[PDB]
mmCIF file of C-alpha atoms in Angstrom:
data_model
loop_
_atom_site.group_PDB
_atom_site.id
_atom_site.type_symbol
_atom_site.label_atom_id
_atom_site.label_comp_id
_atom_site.label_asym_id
_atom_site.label_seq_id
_atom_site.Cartn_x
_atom_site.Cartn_y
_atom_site.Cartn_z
ATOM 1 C CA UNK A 1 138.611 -130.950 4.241
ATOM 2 C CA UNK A 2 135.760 -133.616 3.782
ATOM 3 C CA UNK A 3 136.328 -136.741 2.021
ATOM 4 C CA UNK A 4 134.069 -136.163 -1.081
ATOM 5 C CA UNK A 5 134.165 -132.628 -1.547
ATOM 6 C CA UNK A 6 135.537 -129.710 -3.481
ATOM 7 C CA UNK A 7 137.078 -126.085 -2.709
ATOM 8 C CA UNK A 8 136.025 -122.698 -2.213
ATOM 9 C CA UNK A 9 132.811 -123.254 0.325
ATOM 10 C CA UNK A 10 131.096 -125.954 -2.456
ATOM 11 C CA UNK A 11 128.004 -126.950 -0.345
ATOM 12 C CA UNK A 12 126.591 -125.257 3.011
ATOM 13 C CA UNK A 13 128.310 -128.083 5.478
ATOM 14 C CA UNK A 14 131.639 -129.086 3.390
ATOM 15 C CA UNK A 15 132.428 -125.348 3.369
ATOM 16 C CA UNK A 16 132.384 -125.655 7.382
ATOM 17 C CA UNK A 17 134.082 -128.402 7.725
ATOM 18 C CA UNK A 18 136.887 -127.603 4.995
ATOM 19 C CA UNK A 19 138.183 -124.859 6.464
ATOM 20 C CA UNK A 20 136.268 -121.932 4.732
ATOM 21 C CA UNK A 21 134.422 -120.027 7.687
#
């Protein structure tokens, strides 16, 4: 997932790019 970011869809992006979607 992102560099500087937690789990479970955290923020509106870093839940995109994580691997929540």
């Amino acid at each position: 997932c992102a560099p500087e970011c937690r789990s479970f869809c955290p923020d509106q992006k870093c839940l995109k790019d994580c691997g929540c979607i």
